[PDB]
Design a protein around this ligand. Structure first.
Ligand SMILES: CC(=O)N[C@H]1[C@@H](O)[C@H](O)[C@@H](CO)O[C@@H]1O
Ligand SMILES: CC(=O)N[C@H]1[C@@H](O)[C@H](O)[C@@H](CO)O[C@@H]1O
Ligand SMILES: [Zn+2]
Ligand SMILES: [Zn+2]
Lengths: 291, 291
């Protein structure tokens, strides 16, 4: 009845107490990256110290392939280099109340979907374009998680066969060319260097060099959406993250989508829950899971 | 209890009487292509003349987006040019016994899956590489068909952004670069012209020109499989069709798949039911549908 939500990311770790669908007591600490396999027990330790007592169960929403309370990183460059981490057991040191875990954008998808007309929209996909690219797939009003939580990892479906090589090891993933870190990898090597946020500012001023960089990312996502519409009959796609919500972006994605045959069209919308979706969604999904 | 199976394709139309899972009375006529919107009523008319009496229900398995007894062609160049055809109503002229319709490779997938250990394999995908490229997706031991039968059309997910333009209208589909007709489109313009079957013969003799053509197709499929493993946690992929079953091909696909990180691996196997899978599968799925 009283829930501790965590949102482990590449960059920060959000936490809060989620109680009847509202968020209170919201903290966030930077995610440790050097010596992460050890540094993270200590971070979790500190988090369940400040909250202990105020929760009955914990609801984890983190990046990586979340399966059997172990986080396996597909692209570990989104974690300073960290390949896997025993997430469930490390929260077990600080409470023996029950622990539910779930990928960070699968969780966000539950937040974004359980206010939609589940009659008109039964094939739904949330897509985040942030430090990485990921998704959470709802098919027949259900979250796709079986058997090993791998379901939804559409940032590592192919975007270009001649594309850059991904952190995951495969050539050409959507993530390798569309994510915040793919943009930053090209823009931080400009003279002078640019953060992705500054690249967008030049994009909004019609700089061709910056526009090319942003178009490289929007087109890939447009294609990924088309792939989801044609391959799964996805009716709606909601797009979030620090790059999806960038001003001018979803308009640009949608432009590419409309040059495609109408077979590839569907509703494409911005996310209503921002950076709280991970915590909210992760709570509801651990609620639903204990009946 | 006694079923009329049809397998409408780009090239031929197979028919048979399917009774307790065995096929008898198997005919096949060329598929009319000139004046197809009219020519096909006549072909169906002729088919329900030779069989009438020997069936209790009909089970249709055809190419295209099969929804509400209407065939909508996504790539209509797989039908001489035919954009849509009222399939259900045109079988209604010749019997008022019940009519079940289903895409041709969704149907094949039921044939290929309902002999698999439904315990080890619950995320299963049949993939055909024939005149076109298509698939039928089983997720949680169920066929993916809702809401409009579009589910499974993975031949029109992206294989190359700089790729050829597909019949469907979109740049770069797997079909546009991997199917029999994509191969034939390159090989029939050689001097001298080559059928796809003859291109494979040169491939098997290590001709670099022919090998390049075949590698262009195998790599795309390997990637499509990787996309399915990483995006849906597909455990098994079975690969059929006049190109999947070509000697040397699935070995070549699998070679590309193994150069990828182990996250993208899964069981990849040849189809056990050949050109009868469409009829068999379509029967069982119309059985299961009337309980
Ligand atoms: C560590 C890791 O592999 N993260 C994946 C994926 O699982 C995340 O959900 C996604 C969200 O940022 O980005 C990344 O693609
Ligand atoms: C007419 C048409 O659009 N056929 C599609 C698809 O629906 C078929 O199932 C597939 C099988 O040959 O090829 C083609 O990609
Ligand atoms: Zn990748
Ligand atoms: Zn296409």
């Amino acid at each position: 009845m009283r829930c501790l939500a965590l949102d482990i990311g590449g960059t920060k770790i959000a936490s809060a107490i989620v109680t009847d669908g509202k968020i209170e007591q919201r903290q966030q600490i930077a995610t440790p990256q050097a010596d992460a396999a050890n540094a993270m027990h200590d971070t979790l330790a500190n988090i369940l110290a400040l909250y202990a007592g105020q929760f009955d169960y914990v609801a984890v929403a983190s990046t990586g392939i979340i399966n059997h309370g172990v986080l396996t990183a597909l692209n570990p460059k989104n974690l300073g280099g960290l390949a896997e981490f025993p997430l469930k057991e490390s929260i077990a040191r600080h409470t023996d109340k029950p622990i539910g875990l779930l990928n960070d954008v699968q969780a966000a998808a539950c937040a974004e979907y359980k206010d939609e007309d589940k009659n008109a929209v039964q094939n739904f996909v949330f897509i985040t374009v942030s430090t990485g690219v990921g998704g959470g797939i709802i098919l027949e009003r259900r979250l796709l998680t079986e058997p090993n939580g791998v379901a939804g990892h559409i940032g590592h479906t192919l975007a270009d066969p001649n594309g850059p090589v991904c952190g995951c090891g495969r050539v050409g993933c959507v993530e390798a060319v569309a994510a915040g870190r793919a943009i930053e990898a090209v823009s931080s090597q400009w003279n002078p260097p640019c953060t992705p946020k500054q690249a967008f500012e030049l994009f909004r001023k019609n700089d061709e060099k910056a526009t090319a960089l942003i178009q490289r990312s929007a087109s890939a996502i447009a294609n990924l959406i088309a792939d989801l519409v044609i391959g799964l009959d996805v009716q709606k796609v909601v797009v979030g993250g620090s790059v999806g919500l960038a001003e001018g972006y979803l308009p640009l994605v949608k432009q590419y989508l409309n040059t495609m045959p109408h077979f590839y069209h569907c509703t494409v919308e911005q996310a209503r829950h921002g950076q709280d979706a991970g915590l909210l969604g992760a709570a509801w999904w651990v609620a639903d899971c204990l009946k």
